[PDB]
Write an enzyme that holds these catalytic residues in place. Structure first.
Site, mmCIF file in Angstrom:
data_model
loop_
_atom_site.group_PDB
_atom_site.id
_atom_site.type_symbol
_atom_site.label_atom_id
_atom_site.label_comp_id
_atom_site.label_asym_id
_atom_site.label_seq_id
_atom_site.Cartn_x
_atom_site.Cartn_y
_atom_site.Cartn_z
ATOM 1 N N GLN A 87 -1.545 7.704 -5.901
ATOM 2 C CA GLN A 87 -1.384 8.394 -4.625
ATOM 3 C C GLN A 87 -0.075 9.036 -4.246
ATOM 4 O O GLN A 87 -0.063 9.977 -3.458
ATOM 5 C CB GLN A 87 -1.734 7.442 -3.502
ATOM 6 C CG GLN A 87 -3.057 7.713 -2.933
ATOM 7 C CD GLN A 87 -3.073 8.854 -1.932
ATOM 8 O OE1 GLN A 87 -4.115 9.458 -1.699
ATOM 9 N NE2 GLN A 87 -1.926 9.133 -1.316
ATOM 10 N N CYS A 106 -8.050 -2.183 -5.011
ATOM 11 C CA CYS A 106 -6.975 -2.378 -4.046
ATOM 12 C C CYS A 106 -7.747 -2.152 -2.753
ATOM 13 O O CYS A 106 -8.792 -2.773 -2.565
ATOM 14 C CB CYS A 106 -5.824 -1.373 -4.229
ATOM 15 S SG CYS A 106 -6.254 0.304 -4.721
ATOM 16 N N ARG A 129 -2.939 2.085 -6.013
ATOM 17 C CA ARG A 129 -2.414 0.987 -6.812
ATOM 18 C C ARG A 129 -3.329 0.745 -8.019
ATOM 19 O O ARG A 129 -2.853 0.489 -9.123
ATOM 20 C CB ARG A 129 -2.301 -0.274 -5.943
ATOM 21 C CG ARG A 129 -1.170 -0.186 -4.916
ATOM 22 C CD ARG A 129 -1.220 -1.300 -3.876
ATOM 23 N NE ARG A 129 -2.264 -1.074 -2.877
ATOM 24 C CZ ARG A 129 -2.461 -1.845 -1.808
ATOM 25 N NH1 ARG A 129 -1.689 -2.903 -1.588
ATOM 26 N NH2 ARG A 129 -3.434 -1.551 -0.953
ATOM 27 N N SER A 130 -4.643 0.835 -7.805
ATOM 28 C CA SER A 130 -5.606 0.641 -8.887
ATOM 29 C C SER A 130 -5.401 1.692 -9.989
ATOM 30 O O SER A 130 -5.484 1.386 -11.180
ATOM 31 C CB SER A 130 -7.038 0.734 -8.350
ATOM 32 O OG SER A 130 -7.353 -0.369 -7.510
ATOM 33 N N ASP A 172 0.864 -1.173 0.000
ATOM 34 C CA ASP A 172 0.000 0.000 0.000
ATOM 35 C C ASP A 172 0.906 1.229 0.000
ATOM 36 O O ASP A 172 1.907 1.262 0.715
ATOM 37 C CB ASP A 172 -0.888 -0.006 1.248
ATOM 38 C CG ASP A 172 -0.089 -0.161 2.532
ATOM 39 O OD1 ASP A 172 0.022 0.824 3.294
ATOM 40 O OD2 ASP A 172 0.437 -1.268 2.777
HETATM 41 O O1 902 Z 1 -3.228 1.815 -3.091
HETATM 42 C C1 902 Z 1 -2.466 2.557 -2.472
HETATM 43 O O2 902 Z 1 -1.324 2.767 -2.868
HETATM 44 C C2 902 Z 1 -2.927 3.246 -1.172
HETATM 45 O O3 902 Z 1 -4.304 2.962 -0.851
HETATM 46 C C3 902 Z 1 -4.862 3.819 0.163
HETATM 47 C C4 902 Z 1 -5.053 3.421 1.495
HETATM 48 C C5 902 Z 1 -4.722 2.114 2.095
HETATM 49 N N1 902 Z 1 -4.589 1.940 3.433
HETATM 50 N N2 902 Z 1 -4.285 0.635 3.661
HETATM 51 N N3 902 Z 1 -4.231 0.002 2.455
HETATM 52 N N4 902 Z 1 -4.503 0.917 1.490
HETATM 53 S S1 902 Z 1 -5.733 4.695 2.356
HETATM 54 C C6 902 Z 1 -5.811 5.778 1.070
HETATM 55 C C7 902 Z 1 -6.362 7.134 1.288
HETATM 56 C C8 902 Z 1 -7.557 7.261 2.080
HETATM 57 C C9 902 Z 1 -8.140 8.544 2.322
HETATM 58 C C10 902 Z 1 -7.525 9.702 1.750
HETATM 59 C C11 902 Z 1 -6.327 9.570 0.954
HETATM 60 N N5 902 Z 1 -5.699 10.648 0.374
HETATM 61 C C12 902 Z 1 -6.343 11.618 -0.528
HETATM 62 C C13 902 Z 1 -5.279 12.510 -1.179
HETATM 63 C C14 902 Z 1 -5.950 13.652 -1.982
HETATM 64 N N6 902 Z 1 -7.126 13.238 -2.812
HETATM 65 S S2 902 Z 1 -7.533 14.073 -4.179
HETATM 66 O O4 902 Z 1 -8.314 13.203 -5.001
HETATM 67 O O5 902 Z 1 -6.296 14.580 -4.740
HETATM 68 C C15 902 Z 1 -8.555 15.477 -3.785
HETATM 69 C C16 902 Z 1 -9.031 16.190 -5.031
HETATM 70 C C17 902 Z 1 -10.265 15.776 -5.640
HETATM 71 C C18 902 Z 1 -10.732 16.439 -6.818
HETATM 72 C C19 902 Z 1 -9.956 17.513 -7.374
HETATM 73 C C20 902 Z 1 -8.721 17.934 -6.774
HETATM 74 C C21 902 Z 1 -8.255 17.268 -5.593
HETATM 75 C C22 902 Z 1 -7.963 12.077 -2.382
HETATM 76 C C23 902 Z 1 -7.174 10.969 -1.660
HETATM 77 C C24 902 Z 1 -5.754 8.287 0.718
HETATM 78 C C25 902 Z 1 -5.279 5.146 -0.102
HETATM 79 BR BR1 902 Z 1 -5.141 5.964 -1.815
#
Ligand code: 902
Length: 297
Positions: A261, A214, A220-221, A180
């Site tokens: 991410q 994921c 990852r997806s 992750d």
């Molecule tokens: O697969 C992986 O590598 C990791 O998987 C993940 C997790 C995991 N935990 N354990 N296993 N896998 S938790 C997680 C997460 C949860 C909540 C908020 C987050 N962070 C946010 C960062 C900013 N944004 S954004 O989309 O940029 C906001 C935005 C939207 C529209 C327009 C501009 C900006 C949303 C996610 C990220 C991710 Br993804």
């Protein structure tokens, strides 16, 4: 051109800056349905929701909500459904979606437990003798066989609509070594896995969109889909130079938030695409090489 841009970014160590730029330019659409109080227990993460315009709707009058987005790449002519790892109460919904959307394959990029936590429900049977029945959506799921490799497993599943008695074969591609917030061991291991999914025919337009997930369904997806879409575009035009990676990622983000991410996952995407281009443009040796380097045996 990706390869020149890649070195230009590596030289100035500006992946973080490049990555943040994408976040800043990303589309911002409403996720009202996902935020409805009644759907709170259907979301794994409070800050990861599907946009209303592209969300997958379950075909049921009660609640048609599921945290899943249809990423439709018009130019590439391929669609994917990115979703979160099913919850104990949404596994029936998960399979209902697979059925209604006519998906042939399911790509899982995480493990049920990671860092001591449950990032995904055990939504598929681990033993042939113990099939699963999702009473809420009236579906039956049976493990037919599985091919276990060193870092990934491919399972053949039989999904049955108990209501109609119709049955379908679902291929499950499980990448078990992608951390992750991390990246695959190498471009080779990742490409070896992608080509496996591709060779199964699960991505064919004759089938519904492949389901990819994921834990959150974006990190990852997102990395997986971006690489596949870029290679496809490049393949359609047989021109690696015509693909604008950042641009494709931004178009994808119009359908689901936060795809990819970390700056490193983005950097890895470039790496995978650049290496994959070798195969696309006629190198018939790289596939075997990836298989070797992957150490799947
Ligand atoms: O697969 C992986 O590598 C990791 O998987 C993940 C997790 C995991 N935990 N354990 N296993 N896998 S938790 C997680 C997460 C949860 C909540 C908020 C987050 N962070 C946010 C960062 C900013 N944004 S954004 O989309 O940029 C906001 C935005 C939207 C529209 C327009 C501009 C900006 C949303 C996610 C990220 C991710 Br993804």
């Amino acid at each position: 051109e990706m390869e020149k841009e890649f070195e230009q970014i590596d030289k100035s160590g500006s992946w973080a800056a490049i990555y943040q730029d994408i976040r800043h330019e990303a589309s911002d659409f409403p996720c009202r349905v996902a935020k409805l109080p009644k759907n709170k227990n259907r979301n794994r993460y409070r800050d990861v929701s599907p946009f209303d315009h592209s969300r997958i709707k379950l075909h049921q009058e009660d609640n048609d909500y599921i945290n899943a987005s249809l990423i439709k790449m018009e130019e590439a002519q391929r669609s994917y459904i990115l979703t979160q790892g099913p919850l104990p109460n949404t596994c029936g919904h998960f399979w209902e979606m697979v059925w209604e959307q006519k998906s042939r394959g399911v790509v899982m990029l995480n493990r049920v437990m990671e860092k001591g936590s449950l990032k995904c429900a055990q939504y598929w049977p681990q033993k042939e003798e113990k099939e699963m029945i999702f009473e809420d959506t009236n579906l039956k799921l049976t493990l037919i066989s599985e091919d276990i490799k060193s870092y990934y497993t491919v399972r053949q599943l039989e999904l049955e609509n108990l209501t109609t008695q119709e049955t379908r074969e679902i291929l499950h591609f499980h990448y078990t070594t992608w951390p992750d917030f991390g990246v695959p061991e190498s471009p080779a291991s990742f490409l070896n896995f992608l080509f496996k999914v591709r060779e199964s025919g699960s991505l064919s337009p004759e089938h519904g969109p492949v389901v990819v997930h994921c834990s959150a369904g974006i990190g990852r997806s997102g990395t997986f889909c971006l690489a596949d879409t870029c290679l496809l575009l490049m393949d359609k035009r047989k021109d690696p130079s015509s693909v604008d990676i950042k641009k494709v990622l931004l178009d994808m983000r119009k359908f689901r938030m936060g795809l990819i991410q970390t700056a490193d996952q983005l950097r890895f995407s470039y790496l995978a695409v650049i290496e994959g281009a070798k195969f696309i443009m006629g190198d018939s040796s790289v596939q075997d090489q990836w298989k070797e380097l992957s150490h799947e045996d």
